[PDB]
């Protein structure tokens, strides 16, 4: 059947990107938490040009 993962580079970027997270206090805290944690990747890596 159709599963739940339907990859889209634009969606992933607009949805979970560094700039989206930065836009709101909710998201800014996510970066803070991930930084303090020592996460190698703050936001998902969306590729291609």
Partner RNA sequence: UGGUUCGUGGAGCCAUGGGGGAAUCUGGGCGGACCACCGCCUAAGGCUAAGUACUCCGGGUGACCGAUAGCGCACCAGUAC
Partner RNA sequence: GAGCUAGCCCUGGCCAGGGUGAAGCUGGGGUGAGACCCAGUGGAGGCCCGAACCGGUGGGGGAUGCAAACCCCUCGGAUGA
Partner RNA sequence: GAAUGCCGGCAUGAGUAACGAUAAAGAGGGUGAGAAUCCCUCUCGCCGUAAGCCCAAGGGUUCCUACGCAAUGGUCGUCAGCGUAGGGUUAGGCGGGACCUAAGGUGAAGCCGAAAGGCGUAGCCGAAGGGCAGCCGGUUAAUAUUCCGGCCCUUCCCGCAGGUGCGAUGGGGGGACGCUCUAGGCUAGGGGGACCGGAGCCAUGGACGAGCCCGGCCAGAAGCGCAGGGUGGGAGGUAGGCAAAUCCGCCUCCCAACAAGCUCUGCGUGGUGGGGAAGCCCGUACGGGUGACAACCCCCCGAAGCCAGGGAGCCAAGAAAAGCCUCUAAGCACAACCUGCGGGAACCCGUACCGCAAACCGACACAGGUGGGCGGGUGCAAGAGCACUCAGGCGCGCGGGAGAACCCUCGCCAAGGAACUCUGCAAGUUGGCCCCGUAACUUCGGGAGAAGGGGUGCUCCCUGGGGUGAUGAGCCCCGGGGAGCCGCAGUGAACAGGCUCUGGCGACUGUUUACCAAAAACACAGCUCUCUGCGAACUCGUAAGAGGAGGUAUAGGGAGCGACGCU
Interface contacts to RNA, rule CB under 7 A: 1-12, 15-16, 20, 24-25, 37-41, 44, 47-49
Q: Note whether 13 and 45 are within 8 A (CB).
A: no
Instruction: Report which of 3, 1, 30, 2 is spatially closest to residue 15, judged by C-alpha positions.
Output: 30
Please tell me the total number of residues recorded for the chain in this structure: 49
Considering the complex, what minimum distance in angstroms separates the CB of residue 15 from RNA? 5
Considering the complex, what minimum distance in angstroms separates the CB of residue 31 from RNA? 12
Considering the complex, what minimum distance in angstroms separates the CB of residue 47 from RNA? 5
């Amino acid at each position: 059947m159709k599963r739940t993962w339907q990859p889209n580079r634009r969606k992933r970027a607009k949805t979970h990107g560094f700039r989206a997270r930065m836009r709101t206090p909710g998201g800014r805290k996510v970066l803070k938490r991930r930084r303090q944690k020592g996460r190698w990747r703050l936001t998902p890596a969306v590729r291609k040009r």
